[model samples]
Target: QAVVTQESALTTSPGETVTLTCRSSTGAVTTSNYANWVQEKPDHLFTGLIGGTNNRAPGVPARFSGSLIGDKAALTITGAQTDDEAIYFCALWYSNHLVFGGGTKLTVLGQPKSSPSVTLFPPSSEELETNKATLVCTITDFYPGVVTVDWKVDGTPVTQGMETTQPSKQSNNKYMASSYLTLTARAWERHSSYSCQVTHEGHTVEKSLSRAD
Candidate 1:
């Protein structure tokens, strides 16, 4: 198993230069590691920026470059733009598996920062009778629309039957999204609690539901 490490967050002003680093715990990173960089912008647009260490993907800006710095993989942005405010992840292909860093949250100064409002809706009673049920997690009023939703049942993470929608622009200029966690009605009915977690801009917002809810 391979583990990757990175800075949790970085902040810079427009036109400033910023360097994000990713380190591998297995060993020093090398060109053979086939290190890659990805940029996830507001509105959930993810673009591959660099591949194979220093090769920038086609059509990417020249200001964006990648290289090996010491024992780590580095992503350097020469002159950052306000639009550059996004999260970045570094990945390495080793063996037949790909390992990704925890991601670096890049905040371009002067951009608005707004957290998301999260709500958890329980499965309806009618659906419970039919064995098929769905719980919805609604996220709204978030700036820089990129958000991650996670589901938990009785404190255990649930990955299946989960569908997350792309962020949609709202009239207020904010963004909204929803995620659905489906399970058997009997399973939902038996569970005493369910929770939805939303992560954005380094902040985590959670909403929980119970039988009484």
Candidate 2:
């Protein structure tokens, strides 16, 4: 199967421009593939943007255009608007089958960007007594919402016992997320410090909790 690929995320400021692209893993993308593009404003909201490579769908804004750029199919957005913050997807038809790429998350930065504040909580005594311990890391008030989380203990990356949540939109329009790290109490005690690191808009914020004993 030829898998379709897309940029997982993109960002631009109001009135700025961005080009989100897509391609097939098996071959170079061309107009003969009959490319289609769509925008989604979350919660099932959808608008067809472009189809047949260069053909703009009716009613779509003029800022959106589709083309075969190099080896990929591209959707270029000019004059990015605040309302343009949404997910965009591309679909291409081949041999009576339609393959769609993973939607790209587009964030239009209409406001000042804010850094995330991080808090790390160590495992409680009760949890340690039960032979298992869990540490919690919470992130709040991040703007432009796209962030990645990492967990490490004693200066080494630890991914097996970690779980992180997607950013949640707050009433204030900022974003928040949480990450949890779990391990056996013995393993937790062996580490001198545990760290929760977040990367937002190229800046990294980290919180660490040191073992009390």
Candidate 3:
């Protein structure tokens, strides 16, 4: 329903603190209900940013912070460095998976980032068929690092259903990565939208479905 409100282009001077924003049509960022961030490095890796609000992942630097700025979710990087120059993403925390915008590419020049969107999956349709299948979500032109791929049902989280997968690195300082939810036909026949979500920077993105046919 909601989409990224800004472009994925951002700028900031080296050694300066930049606040990259991720906006949603839904407005104001909150906790438990929804929130997240990710950073894509040149190595073709997408690392987790703010998860479920302002909490950082295992090794995330302290400089990174996630929170609500008036009516949007904000990801701020303090004392930014040249190595910090990369794409930033922000998305919502749906029970199924994280949904992201096109992305915000952060350039360490002055601090630039338009409005980052936070869109949902492909309407998450449904079907009932007896076949083995996989629900996948992929994103391109991002960075490289750690990411989260999770599965949920009726907004409820599933145990042991979260994973971290990285995409291959491209030649143009850009990269792509994908995460998926895998399950048998029986589990999917229900009204659950098997969605795959990816997060980089402070953006979140998702796509889901129940059945094929």
Candidate 4:
């Protein structure tokens, strides 16, 4: 299996946008393992930044998005604010899951810049195993208004249900999808492993988690 690793950082100012990228040493970021982002606030412990990649946890603001920045994983913050001054970190699923960096902090200047990305939010490990599981993969804060999303198991091609939908225009041309896959309780327990695979034109990513029990 490929190891999860951090890619690079970017800088920006208030009302501006910036992106930080994470990548897998082997393949694109996938649901086979959990891809997560966390915020290290000054004098505070890390809080959830993004999970699954694009899905936002409750209470997350609209300006933050997680997705693929081309072939690498990315987290984008728009409308950056003084409060946004903190470090960001990216992590993957495993016994010793999580790789982090000294996140890029943004300072507001005069005007604003632009930044966007594709983020993923996967289901809980239990959710992935509950009789019938539905995993959500999303690409948001996208630019150019053109993109595709897919789901797979192992290396074999599979889907929870359907495939990509008709592309539409959103803020910065955002795109997203929720993939539903079914498995029997009997089959899901083997080595307690499963993967959520996503593909775009340029990159393919997967994240897998072992059932700790």
Candidate 5:
């Protein structure tokens, strides 16, 4: 058995070039493995794009090509179109089995992206009475609906006791998400400052809450 891997998500703009790679965990992917590529549309429509390392499937777009690049099979999409947004999957044949990689979600940006607006709130006195405190971080007004959330205490990253939600579409047609950080009363009192960080589209926005602020 062989394991194949691919990027879970990728982004591209119209008319831009995007290459999705499929890697084999066993060894270098070669022609003998017979690399194949497929596309899955949002409608659950499936279509084969390429096979036999570089052979295009019948009626496939000329912009899509599959070939071995460096040790992995690469699917290059040149002149990406807005309608080309879909999940791309790759497969490689072994001696008697075929292995498929996790498909890549390709997003074609048809509009400008907006950075998220971040707001952080410290736990309330009401919640503190229960021997625990919860810090709230809300990220909103973002475009493309993707973001990464991080929590820190006194400038150091804290990973535990944190819950972050996926970005949800808002009535304004933008996106929003929330993060919650829970800590014991003792731990909460010990920290002088807590910060919530949100990263969206190569931009990071942070909000800090302190004992005084």
Candidate 6:
């Protein structure tokens, strides 16, 4: 399995230049990996900025460029605008699969930032009886649309049997995302606490549920 990572978040003023980078776990990124950069603006509008290392996509702005910076693939935005305050994702072709970096949440200074509203829903009785259960966490009304979701059982972190959806645009222009945590029903029923934590813009928002609830 290949892992990709980017700067967790970035902040810059309008008219400044910023570079977002993507690193691969396997080795140094090259043209063979087909490094690609995509810009996600408000309203779920996604535009490919660059592909195949340095090839700029059609209609992509001149200010946006891609290239190899050291051992990583880099996306540079010059003279950024307020609307450029969005999440940028870098993807690489590995084997037969596409691996994506965690994403960079770029904030154009002077814009308002809103924290997400979160809700957690426990699994149903029927699901509990089936030996497997799912816990859902819903996040909404957040700006920038870039978030990290994590799960914990009783205090220990968990990653298996988890799925998180890409942020979707809502009618109000805010973004929404959902994360599910699946575990054995018997284990869930015996646990004292399960928690869903969402991270955005350096803030941690958490919601927890217990069997007693």
What are the lDDT figures for the candidates, one per model? 0.89, 0.89, 0.62, 0.57, 0.89, 0.88
Q: Give the per-residue lDDT of model 1 (tens digit) for 95-178.
A: 699999999988776457789999888887888778888999999999876898889999999978899998876666577999
Span of ten consecutive residues with least summed lDDT in model 1 = 166-175
Give the worst 10-residue stretch by lDDT in candidate 5: 166-175
Candidate 6 lDDT over 1-213, as tens digits, reads 899999988988889999999999999998888999998876578999999988998898899999999999999999998777779999999859999999998877644677899999999888877888899999999876689999999999996889999987666656799999988887776888989999998999999998886
On lDDT, the stronger of 2 and 4 is 2
**lDDT (tens digit, per residue) of candidate 5 on 49-163:** 9999899987998999988999999999999986677789999999788999999988888656889988888888999999989999999899888899988999999979999
Give the Cα RMSD of candidate 6: 7.0
Give candidate 3 misplaced runs (Cα > 4 Å): 95-97, 109-213
- TM-score for all predictions? 0.56, 0.70, 0.48, 0.44, 0.59, 0.55
Give the range where candidate 2 is weakest over 10 consecutive residues by summed lDDT. Answer: 166-175
TM-score: model 4 vs. ground truth: 0.44
Q: Against the hidden true structure, what lDDT does model 6 obtain? A: 0.88
How much lDDT does candidate 3 score? 0.62
- Residue by residue across 1-213, what tens digits does model 2's lDDT show? 779999998878999989999989879998788889988774577998999988998888999999999999999988999888889999988967999999899888886789999999988998888999999999999997879999888889886988999987666767899999988999887779889999998899999977774
State which candidate has the highest TM-score.
Answer: 2
lDDT of 1 at 44: 78
For candidate 4, the clash count comes to: 29
